[PDB]
């Protein structure tokens, strides 16, 4: 009795990111946290969680949207770069963490490319989620 709609995004994301360690099809490739990262990072973190959140979002976003592109998910993160004393401006993420991620989901059978030119959920990506949200929405009533 739950969708991704019913669960707050702070409790959903460590429950799907674990369920991306456990299953265990999607994994961190070594080249992606090392130095092929998104724009500028004050520090680069050596995290599995880092990879598992950038993908745990990707299964929530393709649910909501239809044709969700690479240029959309690069620009959807939120984050900047310095120019100098000129004030900062809005730039997009690293396309390397987004174009390997959709393709690690595509081999897992969670996402599929539609024939209209775009990106949509499968039933296996849609059920992996509704089960993880049925577990989260059930726990949110137990806990005062």
């Amino acid at each position: 009795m739950a969708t991704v709609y019913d669960v707050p995004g702070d409790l959903l994301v460590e429950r799907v990111a674990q369920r991306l360690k456990e299953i265990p099809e999607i994994k961190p490739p070594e080249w992606a946290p090392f130095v092929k990262t998104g724009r500028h990072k004050e520090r680069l973190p050596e995290q599995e969680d880092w990879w598992y959140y950038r993908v745990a979002s990707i299964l929530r976003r393709v649910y909501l949207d239809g044709p969700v592109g690479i240029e959309r998910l690069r620009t959807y993160y939120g984050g900047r770069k310095n120019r100098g004393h000129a004030p900062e401006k809005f730039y997009k993420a690293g396309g390397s963490i987004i174009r390997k991620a959709l393709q690690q989901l595509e081999a897992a059978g969670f996402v599929e490319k539609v024939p209209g030119k775009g990106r949509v959920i499968t039933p296996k990506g849609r059920s992996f989620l509704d089960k993880i949200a049925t577990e989260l929405k059930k726990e949110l009533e137990e806990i005062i």
Binding site: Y5, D6, V7, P8, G9, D10
Partner: protein
């Protein structure tokens, strides 16, 4: 059952609300009232719903869609409409006058919203002049 469609507008967050009978549904832009991150503007939405009671909150399905920029903006458009959604429901002057005595942001919007940025004498913002120092 019934369908009573209302509106609630504050600083151009327009809330589209519907009040039909059911089982305690609170829908905001498709997501339960639970999805919001600020605790704060939630409590604002929650103000009218206790002033009347949980009795009528539980017995009625409220779906609203607030297309408005502000986080507090959304909340505020949600505070004005639930209160107007609950005064059309029961019908009495008891629930209307009880809101008005508490605050007028439940049943009046504004008379004003925003002002244009004036042409000005070459600077930034509607109400500002270039700095002087020629004395």
């Amino acid at each position: 059952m019934r369908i009573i469609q209302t509106t609630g507008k504050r600083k151009t967050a327009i809330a589209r609300a519907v009040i039909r009978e059911g089982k305690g549904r609170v829908r905001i832009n498709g997501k339960p009232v639970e999805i919001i991150e600020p605790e704060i503007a939630r409590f604002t939405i929650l103000e009218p719903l206790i002033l009347a009671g949980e009795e009528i909150w539980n017995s009625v399905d409220i779906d609203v869609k607030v297309e408005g920029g502000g986080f507090m903006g959304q909340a505020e458009a949600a505070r004005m409409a639930i209160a107007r959604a609950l005064v059309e429901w029961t019908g009495d002057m008891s629930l209307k006058e009880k809101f008005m005595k508490y605050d007028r942001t439940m049943l009046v919007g504004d008379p004003r919203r925003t002002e244009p940025h004036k042409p000005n004498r070459s600077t930034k913002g509607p109400r500002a002049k270039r700095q002087k120092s020629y004395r």
